[PDB]
Symmetry: D3
Subunit: 146 residues, 6 copies
């Protein structure tokens, strides 16, 4: 039976399947007391162009078109009025500095990630100072459907 860690990392990878930016298919699942409260994948602002259709918007070696997966989970909370305080997050890719700041500021207490994607040393510095646990964990092998 899938452990909680495997259960949520698998969910993060499934969530990434709708990513519309082929630089990285990113999925995030926000969890409170082992319950899923929000999810997100990387894509353009809702009702705007996606990279799949009009191409990336590159600036300083990053695609700036997308709302990031982690940010989409947090913004789901802000839009609906759901508390993200005292949560943990499972993400397919290590959070960029912008996502890191938002997550820490929102009260996210633990970050579990699969891919060591472009790890920013300042993101590590912030997680360390804020005493937020970060953990690498592989997505388990799971087959769904017939």
């Amino acid at each position: 039976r899938l452990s909680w860690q495997d259960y949520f990392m698998a969910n993060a990878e499934l969530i990434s399947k709708r990513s519309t930016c082929n630089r990285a298919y990113v999925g995030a699942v926000l969890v409170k007391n082992n319950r899923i409260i929000a999810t997100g994948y990387n894509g353009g602002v809702a009702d705007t162009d996606n990279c799949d259709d009009v191409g990336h918007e590159m600036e300083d070696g990053h695609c700036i078109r997308t709302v990031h997966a982690e940010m989409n989970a947090l913004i789901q909370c802000a839009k609906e009025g759901i508390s993200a305080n005292n949560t943990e997050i499972y993400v397919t890719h290590f959070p960029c500095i912008n996502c890191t700041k938002a997550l820490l500021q929102a009260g996210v207490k633990k970050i579990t990630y699969n891919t060591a994607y472009r790890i920013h040393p300042f993101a590590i510095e912030l997680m360390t100072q804020k005493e937020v646990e970060y953990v690498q964990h592989d997505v388990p092998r799971v087959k769904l459907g017939e």
Copy 2:
């Protein structure tokens, strides 16, 4: 990529992977405006015995030990104070009469399911009266992890 329908049915199946009652491994995902707001699988009341460990509690041909997947999604909303009104649900198995009544009463507006499990005609009657569609949809074939 995965359609919204495929995306959520896949999620429901993944959610079912932690089911602790082997009569049916059930998973449910509650969705509002294409966002996941709650999930649930079938298992004993939290902090109580599960069928996997102590056996089913059978009455009139049903296992009564478990909080049902759909009920776990709704009760997540009740416990946390998340609104379930104007949602839809994706579930691995057709809802029983008890789950159907609760879902309809909560303001769930559409039901999508995979397995046509023990369909109760009174459940159909109520869904029809409430103008809530019950749509069969197969779980897509999806492979997660390496």
Copy 3:
């Protein structure tokens, strides 16, 4: 001689039961957090569907399956509105059935106070015991309203 909290809320549960539309048992439930009422419910059909009063019971295995139960109507008020039922207690006219018991325990209801020892399911007792939730019998007080 003011109504105690227990009497106050049990009286309320009985009053709440006065709109029940299934004559097998007129059930009323009041959900309480820190001695404040946050939700109520009585037993009746799904909203906007038929009630037993009008079309008869829908019997299955010796139970009327037509109704959303009183306790469930309280919990579903919370789920529908987005009101937290965690760390509450409930006052109910009738001892909760196994389905209501599971939902209450799962929602974080910490104590159950009931009047009528209605069809008490031994498995409901087993679960309340394991989950460490008290189930107290308390009579509805004699209260006259109006005039």
Copy 4:
């Protein structure tokens, strides 16, 4: 002969008034949204402070100022818990004073149903009129609970 919604909630307001601790008027209030109870209140001292029953009234200009009013206790339940009082109606045993009237109107309470025509302030009427909020008199129904 089931209790109508109006009778159901007015009965509830009267029951709620049974814990009032200021004998100048036993006031009870029930806040309702889409025929669901979301909050209640009776008149009594600030929580954890003295009640009139025990220490006497605190009179100022012909009013007892000791109590948080029933209507205010309902609204404050909402403010303290974070429950939305917008687009509600209220049922109250006594017509709201000017302070309660202002707070109710400001909170988005859309209709006021009361039993007793208690010290009706003409300025309260003026405000309800301008704000377009109905104020309906309705008797508490004769209801016997218990035994």
Copy 5:
């Protein structure tokens, strides 16, 4: 830079600038963990006449037309469904007995005020009994805009 106390007292004074009762221009800011969660100024019920236009409604030496600043902050919470428990309030004027009772009942834990307006001894009595400090603090001199 401005201390938290100066920051919020300044805000309360700015909030008071829209007051429509010239007996006292009152502003209130409701704060939870140094975040502003609601504000209010004294004026008529929304969509009703204001004192500026039709005059005061005087009774027993008080203008009864207005919803008070503090009450407007609390009622913002009630209307929207924002929790006022475990807050503090900053107000331009010492709260009257009605506002004091409501604030204490709502779970407001500290009161900071500038002007010692019409102090009611019963208000002091209740604050003291509830172990809620009432702190006088001057509005700082702050110039905004060019």
Copy 6:
């Protein structure tokens, strides 16, 4: 008497007075139906170093140390569980691309700003496509305190 626009822009400037990054003192006030629901200024993640004390963290010509003012307002909503949908925002400085994406995604419908700060053409493109109104408005001259 201060118009609503002047009232909230003045508030945004006052909010900026606690900024701890001297590259730009930024303040934001999030408004729903002319009520203030959240505020923010630019500063380090809560309980971490500020630029005032340890210097800026410069990357590609931007200080990346700070959680931005707008982001702090939105994250207040996410942390507490307050809905930011159907709001408008008043900000001392035109939002950067990251803030722009988050605001649009959160359901912010109008942006009023004072300073035309480093206006990103892609932020304009997004506001335009998302049909979000943006308006320049000067902070009014307001003196507070004696």
